[PDB]
Amino acid sequence: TWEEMRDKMRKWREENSRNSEQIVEVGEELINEYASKLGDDIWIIYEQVMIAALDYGRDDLALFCLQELRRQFPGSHRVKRLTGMRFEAMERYDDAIQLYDRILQEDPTNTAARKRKIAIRKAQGKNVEAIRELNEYLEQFVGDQEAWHELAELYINEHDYAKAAFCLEELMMTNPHNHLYCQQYAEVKYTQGGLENLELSRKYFAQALKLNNRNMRALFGLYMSASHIASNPKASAKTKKDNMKYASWAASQINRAYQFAGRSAAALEHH
Amino acid sequence: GEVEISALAYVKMCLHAARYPHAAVNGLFLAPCLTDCVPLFHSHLALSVMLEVALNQVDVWGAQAGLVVAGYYHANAAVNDQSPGPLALKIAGRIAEFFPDAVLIMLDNQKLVPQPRVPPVIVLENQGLRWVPKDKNLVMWRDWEESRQMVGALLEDRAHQHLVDFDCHLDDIRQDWTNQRLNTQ
């Protein structure tokens, strides 16, 4: 047992390293020349090597590690995860969907598997199927906030802004002090466009900003919504004049943000 | 007519798509010949407010550097799809309003890490409200061979993880979306 090698694999797992080259290099050496010595760490190392082998293009090695793990832990959720990772890396997307489907059959609220199915459907260009599947899920598990957020993003990608806005309303109603959902709701309403949507967008950009005074996206949105309102003929002179005030307030806040940023960046470059 | 894509523009575009694999990414090309590149977004590309902010910042940054926004690049998330969706056409069409000869570049972000023999890109031009692919003979490269190898070596050095797009800049406005650490030279 070369301690230098076994412990390097430990700290790489503990620190979640991305050096797939070195992990394959030391791990393969450990599997082939020191397996009798690895004792309790053998199966994690097998799993570590498989993952890095997939990313480094050593599918011979990945398959060997996978077959050994399947033999030691038959039926296990974690080997399924690795099997799914391998199918994805080989772009065997249909086989991957089949695997993630029976994980979610055993655990409908499995977040990792649902998240993998969504990524696969985007790779497949089947965003529309992904939207239908997320809807079916949310009808039965309406409490799943992260799944509402995933659906919001799918609708934005498909340019279905009213449906995305509806999804973000669930997130705002369950997280009324979360600045991000207010900000994204505002961006969606701004994109839907029109004066009424623009006034709405200004207000939620203002709420996001009040919820987190350092959200640059909220600050720019407030400026941009307010400036368009102030130039829209449909608006009252009361609404216009009020938004001109919002916009040069936002503009000076923007003006100040960049100066503090620029002064901070020069204290950083001067070590 | 002809368009010459510079090494720097191609590299930064590739580094962008490589920092966010499996995601759609987009960006802009600048020209005084596509000489530079501003990586834009890697998420929620179809929302218009920060895109509006980005277009204005790069316009005036360009105007002071003697450059104009001359193109737009876009990598689809779908792996078999290199064809411009409605968002790509909308943005490219708007850019052609201020620059009639603007180019729309579809990037195959699946053919990056092993840099292919031929550029993994389709260049389209504006032909009366429609975007149509350019005759391949009209697309020129400033040392294509050298641009291939530097992307390979820089990806090997994890350089793409130092690449800043406008999304990154919005998270933290001290980040330089001009990427002035263009130490590729």
Numbering used by the authors:
A (entry chain A): 11 to 281
B (entry chain B): 2 to 33, 42 to 194
Please give me the paper's original passages concerning this structure.
In addition to TA proteins, EMC mediates co-translational insertion of TMDs close to the N-terminus in the Nexo topology (defined by a translocated N-terminus). The membrane subunit EMC3 is in complex with six other integral membrane EMC subunits (1, 4, 5, 6, 7, and 10) that together contain 12 predicted TMDs. The seven membrane subunits of EMC associate with the cytosolic subunits EMC2, EMC8, and EMC9.
Recombinant cytosolic subunits and subcomplexes were screened for crystal formation, resulting in well-diffracting crystals of a nearly full length complex containing EMC2 and EMC9. An initial model was built de novo and subsequently used as a molecular replacement search model for a native crystal diffracting X-rays to 2.2 Å. EMC2 is largely alpha-helical and contains a curved tetratricopeptide repeat (TPR) motif buttressed on one side by EMC9. The core of EMC9 consists of a small β-barrel flanked by alpha-helices. The ~1100 Å2 EMC2-EMC9 interface contains a network of hydrogen bonds and salt bridges, explaining its high stability in vitro and the absence of any appreciable free population of either protein in cells. In this experiment, we used a substrate that contains only the TMD and a few flanking residues (termed TMDSQS), allowing us to be sure that the crosslinks are to the TMD. A combination of H189E, L190E, and Y191K (termed HLY*) in the region of highest substrate crosslinking showed reduced insertion by this assay. The partially hydrophobic character of a TMD favours binding to the cytosolic vestibule formed by the EMC2•EMC8 or EMC2•EMC9 complex. This vestibule is constitutively open to the cytosol, is shallow, and is only moderately hydrophobic.
